Ligand code: HEM
């Protein structure tokens with residue numbers, strides 16, 4: 001009765017292992033984790049308290065490639081095989097996806113102690129925006145920062161922003177090489193060139209003020225480009241590897257936040273604090289409820305985060321609006337008639353109030369956001385084991401949950417003929433979003449308590465967007481002027497481009513070109529240039 005002999009051979013086998021030729025160790029270096037990964041999944045599949053896990057060949061990497069390149073096609077296939085709740089491995093992480101409205105509820109309305117946004121996102125945003133704000137701070141601090149920013153995003157502020165945004169659009173039509181409407185009556189543009197520029201010019205002028213706008217006419221503008229490059233999914237995996245891309249980013253954040261702090265300190269020095277912009281607003285209103293004041297640095301960092309977030313979602317969206325309308329001269333025509341009726345043939349100056357009397361224009365924004373949600377996936381890190389209602393599934397702490405309202409936007413069950421661009425599906429329902437019942441306030445205003453709406457472009461719950469009305473104002477003004485000034489169409493045999501899902505938002509694959517022409521060839525834009 002000797003297992004002793006077998007124990008000796010374990011030890012012997014171990015020493016013979018360590019003495020294998022390098023070619024075989026390297027081999028086993030790869031064979032043993034590859035094999036282990038596969039038997040681990042098979043064992044995992046037997047667990048009744050876990051959602052089904054998408055099978056993958058490469059350890060650590062997981063389904064990263066197919067998810068990264070075609071997330072909605074990935075979800076649809078998984079949904080057919082497994083149903084609405086399933087997990088997949090992503091660059092060392094386990095992601096649990098809950099599709100559909102119940103998914104929205106599970107994640108967006110999750111208890112504060114159950115999940116963490118900042119633990120999922122801080123590595124992406126903190127290097128770009130700076131310390132102490134958004135996700136580099138406790139949730140309670142984020143809630144109040146959202147309250148401070150929302151305090152400058154009032155109806156009165158929008159009434160004052162509309163003519164400023166309009167001035168910037170007209171200036172861009174007058175001065176930009178992409179247009180020059182006083183010199184040229186037709187031309188070709190890449191919308192992924194023009195919309196980022198139009199977006200930063202309009203958002204700078206209105207949210208940051210004339211000083212910060214004026215700086216964009218200089219070499220300073222290049223820092224925004226640099227800071228922009230740092231805003232990339234690569235930050236999720238390699239947040240800080242010592243390359244030049246990362247240094248240009250870090251430098252830009254310092255230079256840009258330094259510029260904002262210079263203005264802030266100048267205004268306080270001169271008692272020059274009015275109600276012009278978001279800077280005036282945060283200077284007057286940025287004291288937390290425990291009495292700590294945001295620092296000038298944190299105020300500047302919060303300005304960067306707000307401008308940068310709004311930059312990418314808005315620019316992507318007006319690009320998509322232009323691209324869907326380029327093959328729909330019927331929609332351009334209908335929008336143009338609305339412009340003529342609401343603005344008395346163009347005799348009335350556009351105001352924020354008249355924007356609210358443009359339902360087809362607003363429905364066009366609404367429908368573009370349905371077909372092209374800028375953020376295909378939203379994430380939380382699971383902090384406490386979560387039971388999935390009406391199942392035996394438990395999502396353990398350390399997992400991440402993923403929700404995708406943009407996926408549901410594209411399902412025929414909730415939006416008939418979902419892959420058809422049709423602004424009239426929103427007839428008599430042109431509001432950017434609408435709360436169908438009870439409300440709750442997490443610290444930045446009363447918002448919808450339920451988050452089961454199949455249309456959820458602005459998310460929901462404590463992390464819900466506060467930029468929605470600014471975006472509609474900005475997009476509204478911009479598109480109102482595009483429509484009254486130009487017609488546009490595709491180059492021969494071109495059509496709406498497929499989305500690029502790998503960038504930070506779901507951009508059109510470029511170059512995405514349209515041909516514009518002036519509705520009034522002789523019309524001139526005044527002002528000095
Ligand atoms: C078409 C335009 C936009 C869309 C579709 C959009 C979408 C969203 C979504 C889905 C969220 C929820 C994020 C999550 O749950 O993880 C969000 C949050 C947020 N957005 Fe927007 N957004 C847009 C424009 C803007 C603009 C213009 C601003 C600022 C001016 C802005 C600022 C914010 C802020 C501060 C949050 C809160 C993040 C948090 O609490 O964790 N967004 N947005």
Ligand SMILES: O[C@@](Cc1ccccc1Cl)(Cn1cncn1)C1(Cl)CC1
Pocket residue numbers: 125134305308309310313375376377378379465467504505
């Ligand atoms: O939600 C964000 C972050 C985010 C979340 C999910 C996917 C991509 C990004 Cl960039 C993106 N965004 C949402 N609205 C405006 N920007 C921030 Cl920057 C916090 C607000």
